[PDB]
Write a protein that binds this ligand. Structure first.
Ligand SMILES: O=P(O)(O)OC[C@@H](O)CO
Length: 411
């Protein structure tokens, strides 16, 4: 058998599902063996695959999160464009089958998808319904209601009211799209490499300062980067938790309480109504430099991932959105949204309203490094070392230096 190495960043419950998907494909035919290899978080996985390339130890497939997309698109010569791979191997590829938000996020300016959609997400408001009921609180729709609900929870003995993971994705990037304000110039990077950051504005700063003020009395508690704060939610310590829809699998198996999810809170001091939310998660990039049989097996595996049945199963088990309209309709016909209430929140929120350039998503080179900058500066806010205005200004300044580095190399 010819081996197809797939380097990915899926840990926990969702990583076990990756292993089940790979092995199910392996069991259906006898020519190709997909070998999934966990390489760490998204940054570590991307970094490892790129570093392995010139050592010729790189995988056939690498999962690269949305953050890394501009960098991967500029890495011409390192990637095998998926549409070319599939045609070369005799496998179908129909980009129009994917959700419009996915296509618009990942297509080149010429309308091509270079990578294979797989695990797309958006952040949702997770909540502990059991704790809300005990506190006489209601599921919030606005930021005022978030604070009031947090107060009721902590008054009723909850360790803390609200927290969030992936804080830049949640409270800067999605917060901006949700309120139709720009994250950077040149349509959040889609219209040019001469972009600069725009999130250092009063609307974002005022909300971050309001959250920081909630640390007193434990209405808010910071719980670290990425998904580090997941056990604060699943242990029953915090009653509200904003993070990826893709924590559904983990929450469903680890939470001893009744849980739900709803759309992100609206900051009514910024907008009268929400816009839409934006993509997280990853796509699958096929790397150059391998042989024909390895690419044939790669393409056949991507076909296996292209089926509505596998796409619906992945969405149902993880909380990543159904990546095609067909997978969504299959899940609906299966009664999944009736039997598992709230699991259509993420797909609805991505497409809540006709998008604007501010709600399409983001496309910034060197955004892996910018993400560290923004997380560091937000941590300064929660620690009380900086105001949100100063921290966002520093994040934008430091981020712009990285955008300029990318622009200088990308010509
Ligand atoms: O949806 P997940 O896979 O948790 O990833 C969130 C990450 O893409 C935010 O940048």
């Amino acid at each position: 058998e010819t081996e197809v190495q797939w380097w990915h960043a899926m840990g926990g419950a969702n990583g076990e599902r990756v292993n089940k998907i790979a092995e199910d494909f392996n069991a259906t035919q006898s020519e190709y063996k997909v070998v999934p290899v966990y390489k760490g978080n998204y940054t570590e996985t991307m970094t490892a695959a790129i570093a392995a390339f010139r050592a010729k130890e790189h995988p056939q497939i690498v999962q690269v999160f949305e953050v890394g997309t501009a960098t991967m698109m500029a890495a011409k010569g390192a990637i095998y464009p998926v549409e070319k791979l599939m045609n070369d191997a005799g496998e179908a590829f129909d980009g129009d089958a994917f959700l419009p938000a996915v296509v618009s996020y990942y297509e080149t300016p010429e309308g091509e998808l270079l990578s294979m959609p797989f695990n797309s997400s958006t952040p949702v408001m997770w909540y502990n319904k059991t704790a809300l009921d005990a506190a006489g609180a209601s599921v919030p729709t606005t930021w005022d209601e978030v604070k009031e609900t947090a107060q009721k929870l902590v008054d009723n003995g909850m360790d803390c009211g609200v927290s969030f993971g992936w804080q830049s994705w949640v409270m800067v990037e999605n917060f901006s799209a949700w309120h139709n304000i720009g994250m950077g110039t040149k349509e959040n990077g889609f219209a040019g490499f001469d972009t600069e950051f725009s999130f250092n504005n009063e609307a974002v700063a005022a909300r971050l300062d309001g959250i920081a003020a909630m640390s007193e009395g434990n209405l808010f508690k910071y719980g670290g980067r990425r998904g580090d704060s997941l056990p604060m939610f699943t242990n029953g310590e915090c009653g509200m938790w904003m993070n990826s829809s893709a924590y559904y699998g983990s929450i469903k198996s680890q939470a001893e309480f009744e849980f739900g999810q709803t759309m992100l809170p609206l900051d009514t001091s910024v907008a009268d109504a929400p816009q839409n939310s934006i993509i997280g998660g990853a796509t699958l990039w096929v790397l150059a430099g391998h042989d024909e049989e390895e690419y044939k097996g790669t393409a056949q595996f991507l076909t296996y991932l292209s089926s509505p049945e596998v796409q619906a199963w992945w969405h149902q088990e993880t909380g990543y959105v159904p990546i095609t309209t067909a997978a969504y309709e299959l899940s609906k016909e299966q009664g999944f949204y009736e039997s598992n209430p709230g699991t259509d929140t993420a797909i609805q929120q991505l497409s809540l309203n006709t998008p604007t350039p501010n709600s399409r998503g983001l496309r910034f080179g060197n955004f892996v490094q910018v993400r560290d900058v923004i997380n560091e500066e937000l941590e300064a806010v929660w620690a009380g070392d900086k105001s949100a205005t100063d921290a966002l200004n520093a994040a934008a300044e430091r981020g712009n230096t990285l955008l300029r580095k990318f622009e200088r190399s990308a010509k």
